[PDB]
Paper text:
Eventually, the NOD2 signalling pathway triggers an inflammatory response through NF-κB, MAPK activation and autophagy as well as the production of anti-bacterial peptides, which protect gut epithelial cells from both residual flora and pathogen invasion. Our biophysical, structural and functional data show that RIP2, via its CARD, can form helical filaments, plausibly nucleated from one end by activated NOD2. Furthermore, we show that RIP2 polymerization is essential for NF-ĸB activation by NOD2, presumably by favouring recruitment of downstream effectors such as the RIP2 ubiquitin ligase XIAP17.
RIP2CARD has the typical CARD fold comprising a Greek key helical bundle with the N- and C-termini oriented in the same direction and with helix H1 broken into two shorter helices: H1a and H1b. The chemical shifts of the assigned residues of filamentous RIP2CARD closely match many chemical shifts of monomeric RIP2CARD in solution showing that the overall conformation is maintained upon filament formation. The crystal structure of RIP2CARD can be unambiguously fitted into the cryo-EM density, with both N- and C-terminal ends orientated towards the outside of the filament.
Residue numbers in the entry:
A (entry chain D): 7 to 458
B (entry chain A), D (entry chain B): 2 to 458
C (entry chain C): 2 to 457
């Protein structure tokens, strides 16, 4: 068995669960923690190779499931009762369970009790608080601005959202990163950076190091981070995220899930490891001891963790927040918002411009419209429309030099358009808008209803 | 405590060496030796030591603490004859009357005044709102406008009460213990302005009494807020000064709490009749009061004959003008809780750990003291009726919220029995505040201790 | 680090807001903006950050840490002209001279003094031995005799050195790095007396700087031990106080270590010439020093012209009298090891985890730092010449004595090669202390690695 | 002062009402009215008022202060005929002889004695070393062993001198003013033992004369140390008491200083011949002395005829036995400096501000008084020769060491000229002690005032 799990989680703890599995049933386990395992998995598993079993938040899994990468798990309904019922809903894609829920996790405000005994319950008082701490040679807040997971709580607060819930399923066309609530949140984050309260290029390692050394009074982070703080022994508390414009911060709530690779031979060996070794009270605490899982999906072990007020704070944040969608659109949404946060923070773009760009990118209206009528476009695109698209795309630097030549050196106009539509999926949504414009310019009225 | 001798406890800021000379007159005349001591936190030391038995024969403090001592049975119920009651002012007797019983002898009325340096500032400000502006000008000449004790809430209260804050509402005859007004907009407005002065570098958050007096008496600041007692040290330094009315806030005047320095006799003393001779025939006389007043001013005295002289001095005229605009302290037992509730809110907001809205909201619940008094009302019932599970549930939950110290937790649990553990828990509820008490009353309601009578809400 | 601007690092207890005003004069005049920061553990943060590259342009600390920075190549070798060298005192230049090279600008000489409350105690004690008696009397009146910072060894050292303790012996010209005197009877006697005061409830084991100053400035204790910098806050509270000579122990006087607050320039800064203008022409002048001194006293300054004024003040006269009776700190790189070796011994003995004889015996070996430096002297030879058996024998024996953490052991053994494992072992020897190193040097001697040169 | 009438000054503890009756006999006979006053600090009031002119006609005090008044020209040089000199004892004349000149009339020899309660303690201790033990036993029965005036050094000196302390060494004929023995091991040993009694709760540091007499006369303590004058009040209370020899220390006996109560005439009085009639023919007679002695005992009188009767009383026999073992006070002007130097050292060591070694080392330099007398020897030269720089340097340095009060500094500097400023500085050097003088003599030597003659060392 080869297990892939994120580096910030308790991998050495999960390695000890593997050595128990090795000692008992004989099968050796290897727990690896490669970088960008969320992006490495869909590459390697699509061909065939990779890990037997993958550990990540439930949002990426429905995208893997639509791609046929994950094995459709079948735990018996006596086992389904041992885990919480809403954690199963997190890993249910089109009436099919695709991974085992391990633990619910959400972001919390983590504050230094010695530097700040009464922490702020509003974002609006943090600028003021920082000015006071600057006098004593410290800062108020410091957290990871690179990843959009951490900054999203602020963005969603006043009224931003990834995809609207249409009371039963998510509307893939109604994206809310553009709306005034979303602008207001990000504007405030940019303003903190502009007024020297925060620093635009602060990553996870900068943030944790600062708070754990006692150089800043507050950080925003999940359960996993608590392990390192205990070591440094900065007298700390975990509490509810500060409010913005009266309304509470809404962090996206992840369910750390374990899905089995569809291209693995060891499908039955993984189910023994998950159901009978990991998802047990002994197994989960071996992981939790190394680096906290959060509030676990296993009912029996959550009973103990609920007593700890840190988990009580984590669940209070998760209640006020909302659960991530598992749908395949989320991967596009995430790296669309990633850019908008980083550009606005560094000051290359404005907030209005950055989120307007991420609005179209997260939606993917053209890129999905092309995908919906894929074969029709291959058959119905004229050789003029192809060249018009190829010219206009090259004039806006949207095609690389290798990608342009790889398209045009195909034998036929049928195969060229195919190779063009292969690169539309790879090269983003602004790429697709050009082609859909040229298809509408040349009046390819055989393609069905157009976007707008 | 010792029979034969008198042991007097009085605050250090007052004229204790002057009162010591009244003792040497008593020693020379009637033979009984007198010892005047001035221990720190004598307001908090007295209810500890006198409850067991020992302590002073006679206690000198403002009248607000006395009704709390009286409800605790610590003070002797004094019986001066009605020929003597006419020698002191009638409203000063009302200050020391607890449930139709006189509990101490009124010595002097005292209230805070604006004390300004005439050389640095000949026309002092009549509004708080112009002090920020005035400070900026004095910063140019290497000085500051105002500087006073921010630690004690007595001094900062004038500003808080001005716009409409209050300790406990008067129900035209007695105080409503449930209607507390430290939370209201008037109270917020006052404290906000005090915080703003500190935030804009006009004042300094951690300024105590010794910092303030030293600064004004050396001529480093143009104004201070203080009572009569402070005038003695200012005369020595000879900073040409005047005492006047406190500045207005939002048009309305500052309302300082008015204290009546009272002398109560300890109920556990053998020398009850020896103290009454010392008070009525030696201290409360024109010779006796001026011996104290010479050392460090008493204020406007309760004795009619000696007030006649002190009324001529314009400093006392200023003190009484402030006291008129202000209002008299309640003597009720709730005040001790109110005071250290407001003490925290002022200090936290000043230092900038909490906001004003948060700090006063915390002090609102603490001053009201609903749980802490509910525990006190059914004290012995809770000792008998609390389960050993409820005890441990409370002890666990209190330790998880850092409400118990490490010494206090171990001192409770190392008691021999549950009856004694719960007793020791309820002993620390009175000491450790009101958020402490809310945990226990929650656990008593969780375990359904129906023996206990109606619950708070 | 940023070219254009100056970033100054100085300790929080000193007058940093005063030095900030010297920066605003520099900004107003020559245009270059100055930022005065005061981070915690700046003595330990500087060698980390400056070794890589970044950090402050200019560093303010006592001269003892500087020779360790200088041996590490962190400090820029300053070249003030000999017309400027005459403006400061000649012995203050000797304080900042490392191997015939001037490494920082001397700002001010500083030493500890007995600071007493005249109202509570008009005639202060001239012997340590009468303080237990004096405390019993003040306990009756609801106060204490003495109260000072027991955490830092700077403050408790005066007592330790008195009867005959010493950091490193002077061999009439240079310090003998192998002759350490924290173990000697004189040193034991001093620390024993400090422990006895704590054991008899006269002092409290976990009293830090903020506890001490607050107590004396509020008028809760009659005496404290502190430097010039503390006088500023006492004036504010206006506790009628005097500064005087430290009390004697066993007849001999207390010997405080004497610091020279020095300003060294970072070798990895682009603004080397901009700092020299700030130091020589703006800070080390009569206007500049008094702007700092007004905020929080520097002490007895190195600048001859401004010392002329400060010498008149009897507090400085008391400070210099203590400094005469004491002795000047070494600047050598061994001092950093000495200090945190004595820090532990003082705190353990005070809290009562160890005895004085045990605590100082531990600090004796640690301060000497014989194995850890011997490993460093033959570092690459040990990487090449250590057997894989000797590695595992060391790793086993170190783990059995709880000297390696669980993370550090696994990080060593998961290296690819035996060459890289030993490297990672010797990387952790520098971090993890001297008792760690004694195990490895024992195993290298057990396996007879007679290619390594003379042993200890 | 007034011509016609006599105004007598005598200490309050002595029999002043008895001496007033001798005045009414003088009034009835010769017509001149007499007024006997008893003002506080009359030892220190006399040299002030008599130096200008006014004061009493005749002064009653122990002979030690008189040679200081005589050197100051305050006392009239008396000339009793040698037929009258035989009526008083010859060694009492030596007590009042300053540089071969008789300066006052000797009235009575007085010395301290151990005065014990026979009912509480029938066999009194003959050693100081057993008093700690004796006190522990009496503490069980609710009483104390010893209690006496610790404020004045007269009473504690017996213990100090015992082992080998002394004021000024006798150089077989005159006293060596430079050889002072308050510092020596014998002196340290004595004071150490006195401090130890106070430290071990046997005695109380702040016990004055009124505390001591009241305690012994009420029967609250078993022993006191006091002179003859105190016996009058003890008889009234009728505590069955005995007077005996002072307890030994380290084997050697306690050496009390022996005073000769003397009556000197003011040099600035017009009634010099009227006082000599009052002294020789009315006071120093058998009728006159017993009128005083009846009110409050004089002691062992200087008048031979009346001592014959008083010698029969065993209390006087005990008093003389103490006086034999002790030694007679010097009359020299240095004694006034010695006394208030030792006064401080006793009080500081007793209260525990200083150690005994530190306190007596301070009093050693102060009693010797090298600078203060050097200033006095070249007083007018220093007024003329001190620069205005040296004045200000002294005034600055003296103020930095808290040696000048705030009133004294301003009173010097507000003089019109430098000649008058230095005069006012040297006026306060005599009042304010010897460490004050060392500063000025340092500054005079710093500025190189070579006009002034040889310097001290």
């Amino acid at each position: 068995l080869v297990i892939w799990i994120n580096g910030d989680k308790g991998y050495n703890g999960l390695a000890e669960v593997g050595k128990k599995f090795e000692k008992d049933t004989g099968i050796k386990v290897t727990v690896e923690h490669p970088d960008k395992l969320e992006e490495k998995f869909p590459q390697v598993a699509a061909t065939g190779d990779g890990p037997d079993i993958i550990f990540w938040a439930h949002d990426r899994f429905g995208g893997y499931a639509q791609s046929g990468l994950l094995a459709e798990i079948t735990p018996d309904k006596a086992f389904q009762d041992k885990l919480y019922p809403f954690t199963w809903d997190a890993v249910r894609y089109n009436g099919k369970l695709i991974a085992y829920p391990i633990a619910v996790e959400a972001l919390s405000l983590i504050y230094n009790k010695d530097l700040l005994p009464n922490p702020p319950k509003t974002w609006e008082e943090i600028p003021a608080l920082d000015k006071e701490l600057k006098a004593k040679g410290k800062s108020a807040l410091m957290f990871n601005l690179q990843e959009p997971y951490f900054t999203w709580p602020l963005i969603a607060a006043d009224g931003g959202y990834a995809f609207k819930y249409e009371n039963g399923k998510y509307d893939i066309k109604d994206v809310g990163v553009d709306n005034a609530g979303a602008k207001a949140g990000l504007t405030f984050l940019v303003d903190l950076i502009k007024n020297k309260h925060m620093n635009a290029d602060t990553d996870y390692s900068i943030a944790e190091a600062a708070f754990n050394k006692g150089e800043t009074a507050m950080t925003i982070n999940g359960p996993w981070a608590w392990s390192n703080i205990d070591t440094s022994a900065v007298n700390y508390g975990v509490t509810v995220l500060p409010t913005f414009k009266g309304q509470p911060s809404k962090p996206f709530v992840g369910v750390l899930s374990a899905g089995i690779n569809a291209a693995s031979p060891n499908k039955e060996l993984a189910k023994e490891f998950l159901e009978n070794y990991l998802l047990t009270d002994e197994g989960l605490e071996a992981v939790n001891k190394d680096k906290p899982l959060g509030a676990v999906a296993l009912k029996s072990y959550e009973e103990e963790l609920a007593k700890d007020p840190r988990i009580a704070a984590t669940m209070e944040n998760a209640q006020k927040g909302e659960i991530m969608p598992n749908i395949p659109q989320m991967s596009a949404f995430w790296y669309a918002v990633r850019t908008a946060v980083i550009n606005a923070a560094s000051g290359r773009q404005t907030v209005d411009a950055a989120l307007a760009a991420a609005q179209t990118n997260a939606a993917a209206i053209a890129q999905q419209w092309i995908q919906s009528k894929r074969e029709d476009i291959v058959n119905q695109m004229t050789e003029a429309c192809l060249n018009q698209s190829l010219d206009a795309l090259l004039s806006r630097d949207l095609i690389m030099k290798e990608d342009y030549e790889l398209v045009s050196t195909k034998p036929t106009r049928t195969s060229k358009v195919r190779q063009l539509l292969d690169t539309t999926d790879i090269q983003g949504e602004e790429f697709a808008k050009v082609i859909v414009q040229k298809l509408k310019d040349n009046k390819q009225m055989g393609l069905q209803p157009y976007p707008e």
